[PDB]
Amino acid sequence: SNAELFNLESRVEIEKSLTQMEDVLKALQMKLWEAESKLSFATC
Amino acid sequence: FNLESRVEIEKSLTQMEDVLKALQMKLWEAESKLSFAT
Amino acid sequence: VPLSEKIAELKEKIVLTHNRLKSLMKILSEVTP
C-alpha cells in the first residue's frame, strides 16, 4: 500500500516539525520572559 | 536579540513576532498535511 | 489522534505567547517615543 506508506511519511514529517516548532517557541518564550522582566523592573 | 536599550527591545520584539508569524503558517501546514493523511 | 491534540495544544501556546508579546509591545511604546 503506497497509501499507508504515504500516510506514515506524512505523520513522520509532521511530528518532526512539531517538535521543531516546540523548540523554536520555547526559546522564544525564554527571551520574551527576559524582556518582560526588563520592562517590568524598568517601569516598576 | 538585545535588551540593553529600548531601541533593541523594540527590534527584538518584532523579530519574535516575525518568528511566531512563521510558526503559525507551519502549524497550519501541519494541520493540512495531517487532515490529508487520514 | 495524539498528533491532532499536539496541534491544538501547540496552537494555544503560540496564541498565548503572542498575547504576552502584544501586551509588552504596548508597554514598550509608552516609554520609547
Residue numbers in the entry:
A (entry chain B): 188 to 231
B (entry chain A): 193 to 230
C (entry chain C): 190 to 222
Task: Quote the original article.
We purified Mis18α spanning aa residues 191 to 233 and Mis18ý spanning aa residues 188 and 229 ([Fig fig1]**, S1a & b**) and crystallised the reconstituted complex. The crystals diffracted X-rays to about 2.5 Å resolution. The asymmetric unit contained two copies of Mis18α/ý hetero-trimer. The two Mis18α helices interact in an antiparallel orientation, and one helix is stabilised in a slightly curved conformation. This arrangement results in a predominantly negatively charged groove that runs diagonally on the surface formed by the Mis18α helices ([Fig fig1] **& e**). In contrast, the pI of the Mis18ý helix is 8.32. This charge complementarity appears to facilitate the interaction with Mis18α, as a positively charged surface of the Mis18ý helix snugly fits in the negatively charged groove of the Mis18α/α interface. A closer look at the intermolecular interactions reveals tight hydrophobic interactions along the ‘spine’ of the binding groove with electrostatic interactions ‘zipping-up’ both sides of the Mis18ý helix ([Fig fig1]). It should be noted that the crystal structure presented here differs from the previously predicted models in terms of either the subunit stoichiometry or the directional arrangement of individual subunits (Mis18α and Mis18ý in parallel orientation with the 2^nd^ Mis18α in an anti-parallel orientation (this work) vs all parallel).
To preserve centromere identity, CENP-A levels must be maintained through active CENP-A loading during the cell cycle. A central player mediating this process is the Mis18 complex (Mis18α, Mis18ý and Mis18BP1), which recruits the CENP-A specific chaperone HJURP to centromeres for CENP-A deposition. The Mis18 proteins, Mis18α and Mis18ý, possess a well-conserved globular domain called the Yippee domain (also known as the MeDiY domain; spanning residues 77-180 in Mis18α and 73-176 in Mis18ý) and C-terminal α-helices (residues 196-233 in Mis18α and 191-229 in Mis18ý). Here, using a multi-pronged approach, we characterise the structure of the Mis18 complex and show that multiple hetero- and homo-oligomeric interfaces facilitate the hetero-octameric Mis18 complex assembly composed of 4 Mis18α, 2 Mis18ý and 2 Mis18BP1.
